[PDB]
């Protein structure tokens, strides 16, 4: 399973931003990564936001799971 | 009696979940390329080192420059692990006081044993400052040695105590927004206080200059 | 909070300083490159005098 | 203070004009949008589950990271500029070594 | 095991003084004991 | 009985920060008169404003460290 | 004993928030001696004061929440 | 009653750092102006501020050591 | 209750060493601003700081020795 998780980061990193393979990241898949937010993080050209801001968005929702048991707070219903 | 603030009483929890994943994670944010031209996201990491490798190099100018290639690894770790934690529900390893007492003492005592393996006399004959007057020899060498052993405690406790102090004002000013179901005008001003305070809490980069540098001065002075 | 007992993190910090000394060790330096800028010239410069003595 | 008041009034008018323009743009695109309304429910169902807490400081640490995307479009120029000297720093050695030798031969 | 010979020239250079975690180790062992001692007397 | 002594020992511990509320007031007032003489702010003059700020807030916040320990 | 303990932890904390008034005496005051040497006014000169004025007040409004943290 | 007077006993002795908490603001606000006038910091003019900081932050944690030794 | 006043008495008596905290932050900062204008330190310039350090220190450790002699 080690060659399974190692081929997740390697494949993802090349595809997400940058690597005949180095200039493939020069156009970048940042145009593919762009459409998720709205438009506004446009500065990803050489300081690439959507390359980095996906890992940090993954590390937040991964740490939302551990905190969920402690801060329950929910009634016998749903919120607004 | 117009604007009544509220408060909420709730325990503020520095729990201890599984740490050895969380330590390794700000290593994989930085890649390293085996190529000549790089790919415009390492290239602004590679430039950022070039700068601050030219300020912990300039002072020393010795054959103690061999030590300085490590000191730029020390600045990227607590430069990152203090900047990751500003996110919504993340966890900083430099919050707990445990590892910082393992970052000070194996580094601080690596300095006093550096001159004692080469100089052996004049490293702690730096306790002799000047052309000795008579009435203040015992008042001096009980002072300048009590301000030596303070230095490992002075180096670690200054880091843990203000990093966590940033996190409580994040919660308490933030938690007073949630419990502000009274008059709704003052809710924005507490929110606007937060988004100023989060700009001040990017002095978590500024507090790593004051950890590598007073390690250099505590290296340059001894050696 | 006031946490306790300390058998944790500190053994997981020195494994990290096998990582950071692996990445940052492979760093191209402009200054280092500059220091390889004059090593090619003056070997060929005296090589011009190597044919000046081989003739004269 | 009077000068500050005038500027604020001017700023307030321009913002309203911009808002009107944005509204017109939103109105035009009414037929052809099939993206957001597929995923606006999971953020409406999970927000009916658990996601409310003392995390209005979640937005303000994400709001400040939007203002740095403004200067990131100037960080690109710096990034582009970075190593231009380095690559040129490499162009000087390939140019000097050939021309200094071929005339000597 | 090639996380060694890339940095093996570095180690025996500076671990002569840098690999003195014995003091750190000694402090850690003592710290664990005092915590246990206070929880023994509760 | 010590419930008040929980409070005032915390309530007296907080006023030791009142030095560093003024100590950074020196180093920012003393920078503008170091700047109006010599307009080279991008040099090391501004870099000695933050290290002077950080070394003063290092002795600033950890006075509130002893405040919470008396509470909690 | 409850309202006795709360209030004298609250008043003795608000001493520290006028402990940063003595800093902005220097921050707003040392603008004077800088402005008279050089009148480059709307430069970073007045704006470095705002980096002094609102950072020294940021230790002033620091402890004021901590006083109201022990009001309740 | 031994415990409660200790709780206020360390609370008064917390504020001994409040002298060093702003005494480190002055000396690092006096090398912003001594480097501005004469740029020769790399000699004595920086090592006289750290030597100013060592012999003034010797007295900040000097008093909190007493506030610990009155607590335990 | 007799030892209860023995502990809170040295609690405020070591606040008098904070006066040698902020009072030493000037006289080590004044050897910064007044060194660059005149490089003659090996003459009585450094010697009038050591007198200025020690005799300012003597009122620091004197208010430490009260806290010992009040307790024992």
Swiss-Prot record, chain A:
The chain crosses the membrane at residues 54-71. Disulfide bonds: none annotated. GO terms for biological process: ATP biosynthetic process; proton transmembrane transport. Keywords: Acetylation, ATP synthesis, CF(0), Hydrogen ion transport, Ion transport, Membrane, Mitochondrion, Mitochondrion inner membrane, Phosphoprotein, Transmembrane, Transmembrane helix, Transport. It comes from the Eukaryota. The modification Phosphoserine is found at residue 2. The modification N6-acetyllysine is found at residue 15. Component of the ATP synthase complex composed at least of ATP5F1A/subunit alpha, ATP5F1B/subunit beta, ATP5MC1/subunit c (homooctomer), MT-ATP6/subunit a, MT-ATP8/subunit 8, ATP5ME/subunit e, ATP5MF/subunit f, ATP5MG/subunit g, ATP5MK/subunit k, ATP5MJ/subunit j, ATP5F1C/subunit gamma, ATP5F1D/subunit delta, ATP5F1E/subunit epsilon, ATP5PF/subunit F6, ATP5PB/subunit b, ATP5PD/subunit d, ATP5PO/subunit OSCP. Subunit f, of the mitochondrial membrane ATP synthase complex (F(1)F(0) ATP synthase or Complex V) that produces ATP from ADP in the presence of a proton gradient across the membrane which is generated by electron transport complexes of the respiratory chain. ATP synthase complex consist of a soluble F(1) head domain - the catalytic core - and a membrane F(1) domain - the membrane proton channel. These two domains are linked by a central stalk rotating inside the F(1) region and a stationary peripheral stalk. This is ATP synthase F(0) complex subunit f, mitochondrial. It comes from Sus scrofa (Pig). The gene is ATP5MF.
Swiss-Prot record, chain B:
It catalyses: H(+)(in) = H(+)(out). Its main location: mitochondrion. One of its GO terms (biological process) is proton motive force-driven ATP synthesis. It is found in: Mitochondrion inner membrane. The chain crosses the membrane at residues 5-25, 67-87, 96-116, 135-155, 163-183, 188-208. Disulfide bonds: none annotated. InterPro entries: ATP_synth_F0_asu (IPR000568), ATP_synth_F0_asu_AS (IPR023011), ATP_synth_F0_asu_bact/mt (IPR045083), F0_ATP_A_sf (IPR035908). Subunit a, of the mitochondrial membrane ATP synthase complex (F(1)F(0) ATP synthase or Complex V) that produces ATP from ADP in the presence of a proton gradient across the membrane which is generated by electron transport complexes of the respiratory chain. ATP synthase complex consist of a soluble F(1) head domain - the catalytic core - and a membrane F(1) domain - the membrane proton channel. These two domains are linked by a central stalk rotating inside the F(1) region and a stationary peripheral stalk. This is ATP synthase F(0) complex subunit a. It comes from Sus scrofa (Pig). The gene is MT-ATP6.
UniProtKB/Swiss-Prot annotation, chain C:
One of its GO terms (biological process) is proton motive force-driven ATP synthesis. GO terms for cellular component: mitochondrial membrane; proton-transporting ATP synthase complex. One of its GO terms (molecular function) is proton transmembrane transporter activity. The modification N6-acetyllysine is found at residues 50, 53. The keyword Repeat does not apply. It is a single-pass membrane protein. Its main location: mitochondrion. Keywords: Acetylation, ATP synthesis, CF(0), Hydrogen ion transport, Ion transport, Membrane, Mitochondrion, Transmembrane, Transmembrane helix, Transport. The modification N6-succinyllysine is found at residue 50. Disulfide bonds: none annotated. It is found in: Mitochondrion membrane. The chain crosses the membrane at residues 4-20. Belongs to the ATPase protein 8 family. Component of the ATP synthase complex composed at least of ATP5F1A/subunit alpha, ATP5F1B/subunit beta, ATP5MC1/subunit c (homooctomer), MT-ATP6/subunit a, MT-ATP8/subunit 8, ATP5ME/subunit e, ATP5MF/subunit f, ATP5MG/subunit g, ATP5MK/subunit k, ATP5MJ/subunit j, ATP5F1C/subunit gamma, ATP5F1D/subunit delta, ATP5F1E/subunit epsilon, ATP5PF/subunit F6, ATP5PB/subunit b, ATP5PD/subunit d, ATP5PO/subunit OSCP. Subunit 8, of the mitochondrial membrane ATP synthase complex (F(1)F(0) ATP synthase or Complex V) that produces ATP from ADP in the presence of a proton gradient across the membrane which is generated by electron transport complexes of the respiratory chain. ATP synthase complex consist of a soluble F(1) head domain - the catalytic core - and a membrane F(1) domain - the membrane proton channel. These two domains are linked by a central stalk rotating inside the F(1) region and a stationary peripheral stalk. This is ATP synthase F(0) complex subunit 8. It comes from Sus scrofa.
């Amino acid at each position: 399973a080690s060659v399974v998780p190692l081929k997740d980061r390697r494949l993802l990193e090349v595809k997400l931003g940058e690597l005949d393979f180095t200039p493939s990241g020069i156009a970048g898949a940042f145009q593919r990564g762009y459409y998720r937010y709205y438009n506004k993080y446009v500065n990803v050209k050489k300081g690439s936001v959507a390359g980095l801001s996906m890992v940090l968005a993954a590390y937040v929702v991964f740490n939302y799971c551990r905190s969920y048991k402690e801060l329950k707070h929910e009634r016998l219903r749903k919120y607004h | 009696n117009e604007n009544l603030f509220a408060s909420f009483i709730a325990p503020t929890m520095m729990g201890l979940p599984i740490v050895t994943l969380i330590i390794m994670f700000p290593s994989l944010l930085f890649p390293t390329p085996k190529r000549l031209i790089n790919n415009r996201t390492i290239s602004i990491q590679q430039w950022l080192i070039q700068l601050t490798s030219k300020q912990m190099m300039a002072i020393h100018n010795q054959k103690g420059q061999t030590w300085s290639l490590m000191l730029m690894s020390l600045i990227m770790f607590i430069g990152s692990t203090n900047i990751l934690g500003l996110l919504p529900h993340s966890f900083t390893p430099t919050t707990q006081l445990s590892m910082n007492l393992g970052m000070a003492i194996p580094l601080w005592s690596a300095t006093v044993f550096t001159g004692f393996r080469y100089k052996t006399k004049t490293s702690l004959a730096h306790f002799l400052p000047q052309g000795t007057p008579a009435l203040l020899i015992p008042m001096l060498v009980i002072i300048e040695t009590i301000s030596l052993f303070i230095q490992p405690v002075a180096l670690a406790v200054r880091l843990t105590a203000n990093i966590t102090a940033g996190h409580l004002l994040i919660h308490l000013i933030g938690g007073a927004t949630l419990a502000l179901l009274n008059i709704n005008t003052m809710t924005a001003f507490i929110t606007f206080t937060i988004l100023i305070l989060l700009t001040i809490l990017e002095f978590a980069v500024a507090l790593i200059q004051a950890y590598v540098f007073t390690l250099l001065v505590s290296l340059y002075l001894h050696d | 909070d006031t946490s306790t007992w300390f058998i944790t993190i500190t053994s997981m910090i020195m494994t990290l300083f096998i990582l950071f000394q692996l990445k940052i060790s492979n760093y191209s330096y402009p200054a280092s490159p500059e220091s390889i800028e004059l090593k090619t010239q003056k070997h060929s410069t005296p090589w011009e005098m190597k044919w000046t003595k081989i003739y004269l | 203070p009077p000068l500050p008041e005038h500027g604020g009034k001017v700023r307030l008018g321009l913002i309203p004009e911009e808002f009107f323009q944005f509204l017109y743009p939103k109105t035009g695109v009414t037929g052809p949008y099939v993206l957001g309304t597929g995923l606006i429910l999971y953020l409406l169902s999970k927000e009916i589950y658990v996601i409310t807490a003392e995390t209005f400081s979640a937005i303000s640490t994400i709001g400040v990271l939007v203002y740095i995307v403004k200067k990131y479009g100037a960080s690109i120029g710096a990034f582009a500029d970075k190593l231009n000297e380095q690559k040129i720093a490499q162009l000087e050695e390939v140019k000097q070594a050939s021309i200094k030798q071929i005339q000597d031969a | 095991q090639f996380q060694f010979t890339g940095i093996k020239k570095y180690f025996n250079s500076y671990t002569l003084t840098g690999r003195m975690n014995c003091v750190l180790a000694t402090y850690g062992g003592i710290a664990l004991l005092v915590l246990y001692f206070k929880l023994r007397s509760k | 009985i010590d419930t008040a002594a929980k409070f005032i020992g915390a309530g007296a511990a907080t006023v030791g920060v009142a030095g560093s509320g003024a100590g950074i007031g020196t180093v920012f007032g003393s920078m503008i008169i170091g700047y109006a003489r010599n307009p080279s702010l991008k040099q090391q003059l501004f870099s000695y404003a933050i290290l002077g700020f950080a070394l003063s807030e290092a002795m600033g916040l950890f006075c509130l460290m002893v405040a919470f320990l008396i509470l909690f």
